[PDB]
Each structure stands twice: as C-alpha cells, then as structure tokens.
Amino acid sequence: VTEKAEFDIEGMTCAACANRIEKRLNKIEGVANAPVNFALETVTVEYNPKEASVSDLKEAVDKLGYKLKLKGEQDSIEGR
Q: Where does Cu(+) 2 bind?
C-alpha cells in the first residue's frame, strides 16, 4: 500500500510555514498521509513509491525554499 518515510529539514521550523508542507506533499497523487513535525525539524510521509518518490516531494520542499532529504523511515527505532 504505502510506505512510512522520514526526511530531515534544513531551513524553517514554524507551524504555519510547515503547514504548507502538508499541502505541498498532499499534491503527490500516490499519497496517504503526511503528518510532518513543526518543532522537531522532521517531515514524515506516508506515500507509495508507485506514483511519486522521495525526490519529487523533496523538490516540493526545495521549491518552498528550504531543503529536504530522507533520513530513513518512521521514528529512530520501532523495527516493525
């Protein structure tokens, strides 16, 4: 179905600005959820690697102005 990926944020960390992320990611067709964090400096995306990719959504964030890159997956631990 969908894969639960994490991305680490270099630029801004503020609720309303970050809120644009949600829409900028929800733009991806093959998306389910994108409950990004607006303090912890981490974006978290639930999307399928069929329709878009990390590179695409990364571009959406770069286009906002501030840089994005993958970290790994949901959380630092919880192997499941």
A: 14, 17
What is the helix (H) or strand (E) element at residue 16, kind and residue range?
A: helix 15-26
| Domain total in the chain | 1
Strands 42-47 and 31-33: antiparallel
- Residue 51 in contact with residue 30, Cβ under 8 Å? yes
Query: Which structural domain range is residue 56 located in?
Result: 1-80
Torsion 8-9-15-21 (CA) sign: negative
CATH number at residue 72: 3.30.70.100
- Any binding-site annotation on 14? yes
Give the whole-angstrom CA distance, residue 59 versus residue 63: 6
Experimental method: NMR
